[PDB]
Write a protein that binds this ligand. Structure first.
Ligand SMILES: [Ca+2]
Ligand SMILES: [Ca+2]
Lengths: 31, 149, 614, 67
């Protein structure tokens, strides 16, 4: 149970990181 | 594709400790060779990489293994630099830590609808020293064990 | 012989006679047949070709048919010999019939109707009037294993012999190898083990002329013969099945894809057949009925193919089904049968006469050669254009709308090479604006709008931004039915977003505008069947040749172009036209979302946020 | 003055983005797309434009079906 909870959090972290990068990437294109 | 010109730098670094042309260099000189190309490893990391390079106890590495190790170190260095830049993106106030406020601000700016309870759960789950937040080293570790990057 | 241009030099093998205009047929020695529709003898030629030749393409002017061994077997089962067929071909062919085709017809027809398979006392017997063929086939090692043997391993002794049920489908393929195909003949009137059932045809049921012709062709010499009949969606295929079941008067089994199909079949049986409700039972996972006295049973393939342990009551029902002998079996959507699990259902179920009904038979995995022996040869296939002319079905107005890709998406589209690339072109902001304008135009025109999108994320995003109901994987059945009723009855809501589940998982309400945004990846038959099921004939616009509207939004310069081109091949073979629309008139005046480029940048950010996981 | 002699290419913005991707990813190899001038116009050295046209034709060939 706890393991899988952490897994979800891990994915969230990854998603969050990607989000910033993605936004930053578009900034490099448009900022 | 790893590099084109930096490979020659690795060749020069290998040849610095291989003036006799024996084809191999001492593993104990691994620390200096990394410092010749700009790397600054720590004692624990040096011991861990010497253990992996010298599993058979030969004490010498050939050109291919040295080149592979240097490429891996360069990849890890650029990954760490990108992770540090991401940390700075999180740490907009330059406090050195990704506190609850920083994570909440990043989540709100990105448009995520993650609950504050989930934010503090993730902070605690990635909190190792128990300081109440995530530090540079904790963020680096959590990125290391992430799904991918 | 091949010319330098690639044309097959068939001039020498086809002796042309001076009866050019009168005779409408071209018979090339390769097995293909060409027919001219403007010829005065087109109707007779069409009837002759349908009986013996499997059509390939039916455009407006010249139709192309193919000659196959299964088609020859079907023609023989109809009751036509080689002599009359050859005479009719020579009377209609512009050139002389090549001897290669003649020898091809002679060899196949003689070998047909020799081997007979009889299902009696829950036992399968292979018998023939020529014991020499039976003795010769015994030497085959595959036939030796398929043949049922005694408990001690000794082989069992018009002499017939029992054959293993598990090896029945194996024997069917071996008959092709031995060139002695089985005969699917049933004692329609001589049956005595299975009593008749108090089921008749209500006077409200009317058989259309093509439906009646197909039924009469199936009932060769008054005996029901196993086979497959292809009819367009909405042409009363369920009515045809009910009529066939009433005619058979024996035990009837019907199989559908889901519970919705079971309910529709039960409603049609109650609507057209006179069988009592007590004799109608549903072997479903939720609504279960006692199999005792079940004259007609309606179920699903996966229910009968559940390899995992089933419920105790379901086990009892399966045991009763296996014990019970079924004179007639009905299968819906034959295109999914080539699956191994669903094919195993045929072995599991013991039935005398099996009839399969569907809209298309061109599997993308081309697993149809074995299907020709799983059930039988294709009994009948109606012409879509001809039925459109008759007014039985709506004359659909098909169009492919090319939506330009945004440069920001296009660069990322080329950059991405994995399967994540689907989200980029399926979420084109220009495509979104085109879909929004089409929805606005059809709502101002008071049209029923069905937006189909295979991608769950894209469909959900489109429906949410456009504020329309969305149907996807879970789609709780109560809420699904409520949404369907709102679409049918509420005039305020006339736009429904449906995911891939709209193909066969439930019943599609009659509509007039169908817009396809996302593609499966080259499902040339699945989306064609979906389009046929979505659009039905609408009163009021019968005179107009464009009464049903279908639009396919395709991203320019993407792989979606190739998918659309591959998919529309089946519909083009049916004579359906497709007009390419690059510019939509009225978009300039109408205000649409993402008018500013920064909004498209926001949509790009949202799409990129949706990683390869979605 | 320092001015380059080549061939001007005019295409839609989608093709412009495709050429920019080719130049950046070095799929064409050496970076012959030296400089961009306008949102629809580019300046390419004629030594590689012939091969570049082949690459563009390959792109549209893939975005189609073979009959
Ligand atoms: Ca802070
Ligand atoms: Ca910390």
């Amino acid at each position: 149970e706890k393991e899988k909870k952490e897994k979800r959090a891990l994915g969230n972290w990854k998603l969050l990181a990607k989000g910033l990068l993605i936004r930053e990437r578009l900034k490099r294109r448009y900022g | 594709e790893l590099t084109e010109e930096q490979k020659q730098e690795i060749r020069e670094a290998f040849d610095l400790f291989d003036a006799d042309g024996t084809g191999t260099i001492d593993v104990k000189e691994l620390k200096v060779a990394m410092r010749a190309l700009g790397f600054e490893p720590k004692k624990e990391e040096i011991k861990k990489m010497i253990s992996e390079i010298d599993k058979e106890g030969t004490g010498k590495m050939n050109f291919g293994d040295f080149l592979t190790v240097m490429t891996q170190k360069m990849s890890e260095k650029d990954t760490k630099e990108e992770i540090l830049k991401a940390f700075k993106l999180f740490d907009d106030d330059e406090t050195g830590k990704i506190s609850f406020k920083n994570l909440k601000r990043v989540a709100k700016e990105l448009g995520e609808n993650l609950t504050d309870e989930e934010l503090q759960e993730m902070i605690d789950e990635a909190d190792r020293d128990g300081d109440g937040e995530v530090s540079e080293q904790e963020f680096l570790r959590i990125m290391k064990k992430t799904s991918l990057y | 012989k091949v010319d330098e241009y690639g044309a097959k030099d068939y001039r020498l093998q086809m002796p042309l006679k001076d009866d050019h205009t009168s005779r409408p047929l071209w018979v090339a020695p390769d097995g293909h047949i060409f027919l001219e529709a403007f010829s005065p003898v087109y109707k007779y030629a069409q009837d002759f070709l349908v009986a013996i030749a499997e059509p390939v393409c039916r455009p407006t002017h010249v139709h192309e048919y193919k000659l196959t061994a299964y088609s020859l077997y079907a023609a023989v089962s109809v009751g036509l010999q080689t002599s009359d067929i050859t005479e009719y071909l020579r009377k209609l062919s512009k050139t002389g019939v090549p001897d290669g085709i003649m020898q091809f017809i002679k060899l196949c027809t003689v070998s047909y109707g020799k081997v007979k398979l009889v299902l009696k006392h829950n036992r399968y017997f292979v018998e023939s009037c020529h014991p020499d063929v039976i003795q010769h086939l015994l030497q085959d090692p595959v036939i030796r294993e398929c043949r049922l043997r005694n408990s001690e391993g000794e082989a069992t002794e018009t002499v017939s012999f029992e054959v293993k049920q598990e090896m029945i489908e194996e024997l069917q393929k071996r008959c092709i190898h031995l060139e002695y195909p089985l005969l699917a003949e049933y004692d329609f009137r001589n049956d005595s083990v299975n009593p008749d059932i108090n089921i008749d045809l209500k006077p409200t049921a009317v058989l259309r002329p093509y439906q009646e012709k197909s039924l009469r062709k199936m009932f060769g010499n008054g005996r029901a013969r196993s086979g497959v009949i292809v009819l367009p969606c909405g042409a009363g295929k369920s009515l045809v099945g009910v009529t066939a079941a009433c005619t058979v008067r024996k035990r009837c089994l019907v199989l559908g894809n889901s519970a919705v199909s079971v309910e529709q079949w039960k409603a049609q049986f109650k609507m057209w057949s006179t069988i009592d409700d007590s004799q109608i039972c549903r072997f479903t996972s939720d609504a279960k009925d006692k199999p005792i006295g079940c004259s007609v049973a309606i179920s699903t393939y996966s229910m009968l193919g559940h390899t995992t342990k089933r419920s105790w009551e379901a086990e009892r029902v399966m045991e009763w089904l296996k014990t019970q002998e079924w004179g007639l079996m009905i299968l819906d959507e034959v295109h999914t049968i080539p699956a191994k699990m669903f094919r195993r259902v045929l072995t599991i179920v013991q039935a005398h006469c099996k009839l399969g009904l569907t809209a298309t038979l061109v599997r993308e995995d081309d697993k149809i050669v074995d299907l020709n022996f799983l059930i039988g040869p294709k009994l009948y296939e109606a012409n879509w254009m001809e039925l459109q002319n008759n007014g039985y079905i709506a004359k659909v107005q098909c169009a492919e709308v090319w939506c330009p890709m945004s440069p920001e998406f296009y660069r990322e589209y080329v950059a991405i090479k994995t399967k994540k690339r689907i989200l980029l072109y399926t979420m084109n902001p220009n495509k979104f604006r085109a879909c929004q304008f089409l929805i606005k135009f059809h709502e101002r025109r008071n049209d029923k709008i069905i937006v189909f999108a295979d991608n769950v994320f894209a469909l959900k995003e489109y429906a949410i931004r456009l504020n329309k109901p969305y149907i996807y994987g879970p789609t709780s059945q109560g809420e699904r039915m409520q949404i369907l009723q709102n679409f049918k009855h509420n005039p305020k809501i006339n736009t429904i977003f449906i995911s891939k589940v709209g193909d066969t998982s439930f019943d599609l309400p009659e509509a007039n505008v169908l817009i396809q945004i996302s593609s499966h990846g080259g499902s040339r038959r699945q989306e064609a069947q979906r389009l046929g099921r979505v659009l039905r004939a609408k009163k009021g616009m019968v005179a107009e040749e464009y009464n049903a509207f279908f639009y396919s939004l395709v991203s320019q310069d993407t792989q979606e172009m190739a998918y659309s081109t591959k998919r529309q091949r089946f519909l083009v073979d049916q004579g359906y036209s497709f007009k390419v629309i690059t510019k939509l008139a009225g978009m300039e005046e109408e205000d649409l979302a993402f008018s500013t480029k920064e909004e498209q940048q926001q949509l790009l950010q949202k799409v990129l946020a949706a990683t390869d996981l979605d | 003055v320092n001015v380059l002699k080549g061939v001007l290419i005019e295409c839609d913005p989608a093709m412009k983005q495709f050429l920019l991707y080719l130049d950046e990813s070095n799929a064409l190899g050496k970076k012959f797309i030296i400089q961009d001038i306008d949102d629809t116009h580019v300046f390419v050295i004629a030594e590689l434009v012939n091969v570049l046209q082949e690459r563009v034709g390959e792109l549209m060939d893939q975005n189609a079906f073979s009959l």
